[PDB]
Each structure stands twice: as structure tokens, then as C-alpha cells.
Amino acid sequence: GTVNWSVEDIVKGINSNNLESQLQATQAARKLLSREKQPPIDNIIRAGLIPKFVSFLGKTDCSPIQFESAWALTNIASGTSEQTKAVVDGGAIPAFISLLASPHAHISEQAVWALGNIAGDGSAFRDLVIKHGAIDPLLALLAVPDLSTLACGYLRNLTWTLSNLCRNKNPAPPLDAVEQILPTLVRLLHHNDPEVLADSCWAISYLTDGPNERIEMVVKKGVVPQLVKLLGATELPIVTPALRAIGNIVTGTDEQTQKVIDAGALAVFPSLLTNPKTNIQKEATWTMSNITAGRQDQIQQVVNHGLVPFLVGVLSKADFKTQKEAAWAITNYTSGGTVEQIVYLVHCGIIEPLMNLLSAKDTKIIQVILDAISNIFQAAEKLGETEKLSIMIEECGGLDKIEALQRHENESVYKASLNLIEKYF
């Protein structure tokens, strides 16, 4: 009966004075809006239906029309910002928050979903959802002794919505909303469902993408060990956000970085730095770059875990973007490391792959490599071994490349190159 109605028919039913006729037309709208092929969102909006749907959310006596309207609005809210805005502008936010307490689980879940789409639009709607009081009722739905008793789909939707309330920057979510959410998030991060884990990690990744104070709020909750565990998961949808979270954390303080190391993270990098997914290798290498920017004792842990050969590996062969992160990781290591640590790097074979990357058409990577060479030469100067290095660089074709770079456009490039030639060749 409610398959493939026209918008005109939906409108006629919705404007009837008959709740059952309105219910059938609302369901017909839900079915239109639930089709994967070009759902007619704008036509439904243009027909003026959103205010009617919103009013139906409040019909406690007709739970089916609450559900159908919720679903229809969910799918409108899933579209463009302008489509999401039409839902918000119809007063949907307070009406969905009221439904979070519905005795019908399918309706509460629909309201969770709709609020997730609203919040997911951006910081302003996220923050408006929060100001209307969404967080308390959302968290109340997860206030159970054991998360395993909840239906799987419902728990996944709640996790996803909460992740959207943690998402976006400029600004980041309200500090007090983050403090309120984090204890539930910590619990969900220990749940055994792969999709809940994935979304829980995304939420943590968002919360750690910011200044040191935001990182600290998360790290203080003791999640870093669980994140390192998830970093070793078999499911890529888990590894991706877990690694992003760990990566964000090591952009903080040397002390926040040490928690990642102490939790055992470095033992996972042999696999991450060889991972067949390009993006994992790239983000793992970026993570390493921010660990090598740390203290000498942290550099030493990188050395001890056998990770320098793996950096030589990525430098030698990887997607260009990963190779650029590896270049950074080396320049950092060389800027902060002791002489012995820098010697080790040369003994692992860093020179030839570094030199091969000097032929790249990226100015920034050339600057990075030139900086690293300078630091390595400096360490050799303290050992009286400048010539050994000069020879090495010459034999692998490096001197040729540095000469050319004296004739490079960029000022820093030609200067740093000239200095090296003048000082060591």
C-alpha cells in the first residue's frame, strides 16, 4: 500500500484530518526516503512536510507515526548541510531528545540515529544538540551493568552518535560535555563488538586531535593501554582509528608520549610500518616522526625496539607520502639524538635511501633531507669522521644530487646545499 507513492499523494494523506491516513502517508514518505537511488529529499522538503513530521514525533498515542516520522527525518538529516538544517529548523532537536526516553526501543534508537546525523553535520549543530540536553538521556541509555545485554544495532547506533558529539574542531566540543561523555566512552572501548570498538576509537581520535590539555583529559582516563591493544587488532576499521588516536597522543608532551611507549606501542610498529594498507603505513610513520621528535631516552626505545631498520625500509620504498613522513622521522631523530644514536642510523643504512629522495620534486622534503644530512655531518664532526660520510654520500650518487640543488629555485635549498658542498665536499 505504501510503496512508490507520489509526493503529491503523501501530501494529501498528511494533510488529511485522519491520523491513520497520516500514518500511511508518513510511512510512504519513509519508504521514498529509504530508497538508495536518489531519495527525493528536496521534493519532500519543498512539499513542506518537515513541520508535520516533527509534530508527529510528539504523538505518544500513535507510536507507529512517531517511528515513521523519526525515520523519515533521520534520512532527510542524513543529506546535505542544507537538508540537515531544514530538519533542525523544524524544531526536530528537542522533539528527538524527548524520544530518547521512549518505552519503545525502536523509537529511542531512531531518535539516537537522527541526533547523530544532526550532530555529525558540524560543530554548530553538535553544540546545539548538546545545549538542548542530549547527553544525559543518551548516556542513561548505556547505564546498564553489562553492555552485552543491549541489542547490537542499538549499541552501535549509540556509540556512533556519541562519536559525532565528540567530533569536529573550531571549536572542539565543550570541555564539560567531553568530561561527561568520556567515562562511557572508556567502557565502550572495552566492549567486544568490532563496530563499537571502531567508533569508540574514532571518538577518542577526535578527542585527542587538539591541544595538550585535550589529550591529557583522555590520557588521564587510562585508555592508552587499551588503544595499544586495539592497535594490534586484525580488523582494519579498528586499527585505523586506534592508530590515529595514538598518533594524536604523541603530538602532545614528552610525558604523554611516554605513556604510549610504556604501554607497549613500539612492539606493534614492525607490522604497522610494513602494513599493506598505504594509509596505515603513512600514519604509523607520522606517529614515529613524533616519537623521534622526543627525548634521547625515547629515541633509544625506538632503537631498542629495532625500528630504525624499519624506517630505512620506508625511506627506501613506500608511497611518496609515507617516504616524506619517514624523512621527517629521520630529521627529528638526527636533531634530537645523541652522537651514538646518529652513528647507529648511518650503520643501519640511512644514507643511500635519503640521497635517493633528493631527486624528489617536493621542496619541503628536500629541505628535510638536507637538514638531516647537516645533523649527521655535525655528529661526524664530533667524531672526526666527516670524510667517511662524505665518501659514502659520494659513492651512492649523493654528491651529484647536492651539487644540482645549489642550482635549485628555493633559497633554503640552494643555500643549505652550497653550505654542505663548501663545508664537506
Binding site: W71, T74, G79, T84
Partner: peptide, 9 residues
């Protein structure tokens, strides 16, 4: 994703 439509139930 950030937003998602409900397709079935």
C-alpha cells in the same frame, strides 16, 4: 561515515 541514512528494518 559522519551521516548515514537508514535503508532497512
Amino acid at each position: 561515515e559522519v551521516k548515514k541514512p537508514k535503508i532497512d528494518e
